[PDB]
Amino acid sequence: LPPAYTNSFTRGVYYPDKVFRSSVLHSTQDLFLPFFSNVTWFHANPVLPFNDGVYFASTEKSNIIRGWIFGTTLDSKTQSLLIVNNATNVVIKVCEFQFYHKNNKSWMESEFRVYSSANNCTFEYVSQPFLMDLEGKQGNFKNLREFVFKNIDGYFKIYSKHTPINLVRDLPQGFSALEPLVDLPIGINITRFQTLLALSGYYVGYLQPRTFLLKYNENGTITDAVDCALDPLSETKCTLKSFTVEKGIYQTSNFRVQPTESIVRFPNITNLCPFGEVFNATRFASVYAWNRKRISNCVADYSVLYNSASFSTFKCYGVSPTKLNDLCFTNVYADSFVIRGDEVRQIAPGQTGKIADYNYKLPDDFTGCVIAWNSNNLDSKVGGNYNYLYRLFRKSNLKPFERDISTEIYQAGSTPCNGVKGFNCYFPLQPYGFQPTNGVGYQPYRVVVLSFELLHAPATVCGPKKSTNLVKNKCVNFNFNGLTGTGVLTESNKKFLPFQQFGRDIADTTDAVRDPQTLEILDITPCSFGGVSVITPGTNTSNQVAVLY
Amino acid sequence: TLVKQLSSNFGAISSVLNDILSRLDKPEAEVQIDRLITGRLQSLQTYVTQ
């Protein structure tokens, strides 16, 4: 039935918690009906959207308002919440109902008088009724029943109040807060709201994230409130924690220009990184003499090395395995080698052990990723054994990314002479732990370590991120070869040298950048952050204020 | 001095928040960020006291 529009002003407030407070002003962030909002009136079953929550009110009796339905598109496929107001009680049920909402026959049967359901078994709550009548016209003439319906996470909450009002076909002023009449732990998805009039009028509004300053009197009753998003004066009250503001100028907030658009720019690289030559090399060096391969001037798709079968580990250090695809790198290396398999932990940046100390060490910072896969085949052949392991070093803690294959004599201190027995001659050991197709540590885990050096120097390896155009003269969210930031881009007209990629100011912050495709130099000017203060003549004089940026 | 302190990198992998958020995941970035907040807050408190 036909709509109309009005406003609330003094409604939408409810007790946000189950806590008793008195004689205080309490600031809370929750879903509330904004004080000045457009409330839609309907004549008195239209289906309305359900967003964060719904404000409902109507000066009508239970003989018309027989209940409400909340849920997703109503069907037998998903559960819906049916709230019905009976003569002496309220019955609430959740189920895959097609209908079930009749409760009164007349003529309107085309979408009614049907009772289809499934395995309800979901919070069939019953209580005293939501709607209580008055002694005819011995009250204030009609009773505006108010409800708030919330759906947060596992709970559907109902707040309400009665408080009879002076007769008017509109919403009242004054002030009243609603109480949590019902609190139901229902894991239900609600996207649509429908009334049950079985056909006056009713009002519907929507809740929004707002911070309110609530005033509790001596009896712990909310008697008033301030909506912080209503205006500069309300904002001032909320920052000062007072419903009265003295004459003067106050600092309340911070102005900020939003970027709106975004810019993504990378070097025009069409080459792909030769990861196949690393991970599918089939020829893996021993850790004793690990193979260092450099990757450059290519696009690095790392997701294919992560979202892939057969890998036993993919441990990233200093970087996320799901974000590295959006990063630019310089001088990327891939260290390829074979270890016993139970030694995987020894190639972590900070662990100890013969591998960590003598064969292959990573630096404390090590930005990079350690990737390994079982591959028992090819390497662990029966009768085979091809994996040198360095055991005796003389010194200790070789060095990060260092390699030692001199194969000398481990003087044990037994005597300063050249020999084998008692001299521990031969730094590696021939008895490689191959134990073909048996035991533990039978040489599974081919290892590739990706070392990601992150310099401000020109990117040579970039992920598979599509570039876009420039905007200029507007505050934007930009990314120039990984140089992420926000600001206004303009031509710099600066004398950059041929080898310089970007510049910095006296504070050593990025001042300008070179565009990777056009090679032009753009200045980066931070967008306005201003600062907002409010000039108040005194609330005992006027509620008019001026705003200074 | 107050400005220079922004580049201190107080035990974090980077002095720049954007280079942490774009690099590490949620629970990881929080650790690096807490280090920068602690240091920057201490630097600012020192400034105000002076």
Binding site: D505, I506, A507, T509, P526 | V3, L6
Partner: peptide, 24 residues
């Protein structure tokens, strides 16, 4: 333009990165 004395003019002439920082 500035209603300053000769001495005041000498005094004024002689004496000589918005990261959330501002000056009022």
């Amino acid at each position: 333009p500035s209603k300053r004395s000769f001495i005041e003019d000498l005094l004024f002439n002689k004496v000589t990165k918005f990261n959330g920082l501002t000056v009022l």
